[PDB]
Write a protein that binds this ligand. Structure first.
Ligand SMILES: Cc1cc2nc3c(=O)[nH]c(=O)nc-3n(C[C@H](O)[C@H](O)[C@H](O)COP(=O)(O)OP(=O)(O)OC[C@H]3O[C@@H](n4cnc5c(N)ncnc54)[C@H](O)[C@@H]3O)c2cc1C
Length: 453
């Protein structure tokens, strides 16, 4: 129980009632520092712990694919917490109104939540803080090293953040204690109903084909905490060995496929890192994978935490902004609208295949994501319109979207965040370029294009 994982958002008079865990980003019962601290605090106060989750009004800004994945897991989570004698309350509406009202209606003693550097989460904290009188803590249950501990400032490169993070692994990379149940079960609708109503409201905006057939295939990733562990186990046993050599090959499915579970916190990245560390496989593949789930994942939280405008042109490096400004007035070879990007109606069959994989599976291969976002910059009227389009399609169709990794990944592709300058070209300037022929020499593009007609 390292106290550096927890941080106080506001101090107050601790009440004589249950400790409330405002679960948001880490939707799991196991390996959850936020829930573990909540139980520890509730134990010292001789009071039970309770979990509250808010089904917010912004769910209509995504699709059915994300909504069902999240709620199906929450249905499983409600069963796990029950076995621990921990009740779970699911509220519908504004977290500011609902969290504050729950604190007063149930006489909460202390309020706890997990950490997310996203703007929407800060928005909720502001409203909640001004509507409660009890202490309020947040715990980093998503990063191995607490975001505010890994670095005190924005890190402009992976090689400047990698040593800082590895130096702190010996202290923060540790096993998880068991979640002790509640002593006695203490004394707002069912999830099957909130799911049915939500799906009905999302159906008109469901992505379809010409024949009114849904595009999304929901049999690629089963949601839940139990499914995530099976995915983790399969990766270490079968794919981890080849990960280092086939991570950049879209035609081969040699990725961990953990992002949907990591995004919703249905599985702890610290748990994955522990299991990987103790697994014997190709050394370079271990290094490659750990580099992605430790450095690149947690540097994205670092990006969004220390850059209020992480989703804007203002957060780009100075060299990228001055380079992109110098080529604003360059004549673009193609200009596509949002609907044209969305439907995969460009001239580049590789880009359209990447969009089709996004629409059909909700998870685009890591390598094609880079190619996908860079051509949006190349075929847009400006870098600002490119960020807008990339963020829209990413957050709308990726199962792992609306995530710090997404904004940090898009900022890398379009603005060169966490990257260096390259040969100066027109339109894209010094931003790293990825040509069509460059991909042909990297993998069998024809197979990838064929798999997503
Ligand atoms: C334009 C663009 C958009 C992206 N969109 C998202 C997104 O919406 N959500 C998201 O979580 N990630 C995003 N990524 C990062 C990466 O593409 C995906 O995380 C990865 O493809 C997820 O699938 P996986 O778990 O099977 O990959 P794996 O190779 O098995 O890697 C495992 C984990 O390492 C992390 N990781 C891997 N690559 C990156 C990276 N470049 N940056 C940060 N973390 C990484 C992820 O957490 C990932 O789950 C994006 C990257 C780019 C360039």
């Amino acid at each position: 129980m390292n106290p550096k994982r927890i941080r106080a958002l506001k101090s107050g008079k601790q009440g004589d009632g249950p400790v409330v865990y405002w679960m948001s980003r880490d939707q799991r019962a196991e390996d959850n520092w936020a829930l573990l601290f909540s139980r520890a605090i509730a134990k010292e106060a001789n009071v039970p712990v309770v979990v509250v989750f808010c089904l917010t009004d912004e769910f209509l800004e995504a699709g059915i694919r994300q909504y069902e994945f999240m709620l199906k897991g929450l249905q499983e989570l409600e069963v796990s917490l029950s076995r621990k004698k921990i009740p779970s309350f699911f509220l519908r509406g504004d977290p500011g109104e609902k969290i504050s009202r729950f604190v007063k209606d149930y006489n909460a003693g202390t309020l706890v939540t997990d950490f997310s550097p996203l703007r929407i989460k800060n928005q909720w904290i502001e409203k909640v803080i001004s509507g409660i009188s009890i202490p309020f803590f947040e715990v980093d249950a998503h990063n191995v090293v607490p975001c505010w501990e890994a670095s005190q400032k924005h890190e402009y490169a992976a090689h400047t953040f990698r040593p800082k993070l590895y130096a702190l692994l010996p202290e923060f990379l540790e096993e998880f204690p068991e979640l002790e149940p509640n002593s006695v079960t203490p004394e707002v609708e069912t999830l099957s109903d909130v799911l049915e109503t939500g799906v009905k409201a999302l159906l008109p905006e469901r992505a379809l084909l010409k024949n009114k057939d849904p595009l999304f295939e929901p049999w690629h990733f089963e949601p839940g905490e139990k499914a995530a562990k099976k995915v983790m186990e399969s990766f270490i046993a079968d794919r981890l060995d080849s990960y280092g050599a086939l991570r950049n090959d879209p035609t081969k499915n040699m990725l961990s496929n953990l992002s949907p579970y990591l995004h919703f916190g249905q599985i702890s990245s610290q748990r994955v890192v522990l299991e990987v560390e103790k697994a014997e496989s190709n050394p370079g593949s271990k290094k490659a994978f750990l580099d992605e789930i430790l450095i690149w994942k947690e540097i994205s939280d670092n990006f969004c935490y220390y850059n209020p405008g992480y989703d804007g042109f203002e957060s780009f490096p100075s060299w990228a902004k001055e380079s992109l400004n110098a080529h604003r007035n360059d004549v673009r070879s193609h200009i596509y609208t949002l609907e044209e990007f969305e439907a995969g109606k460009t001239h580049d069959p590789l880009w359209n295949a990447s969009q089709m994989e996004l629409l059909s599976t909700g998870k685009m291969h890591g390598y094609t994501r880079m190619y996908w976002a860079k051509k949006i910059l190349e075929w847009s009227e400006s870098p600002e319109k490119a960020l807008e389009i990339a963020i829209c399609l990413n957050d709308r169709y990726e199962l792992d979207g609306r995530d710090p990794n997404g904004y940090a990944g898009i900022a890398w592709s379009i603005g060169g965040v966490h990257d260096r300058a390259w040969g100066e070209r027109e339109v894209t300037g010094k931003i790293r370029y990825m040509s069509y022929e460059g991909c042909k020499r990297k993998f069998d593009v024809k197979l990838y294009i064929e798999k997503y007609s």
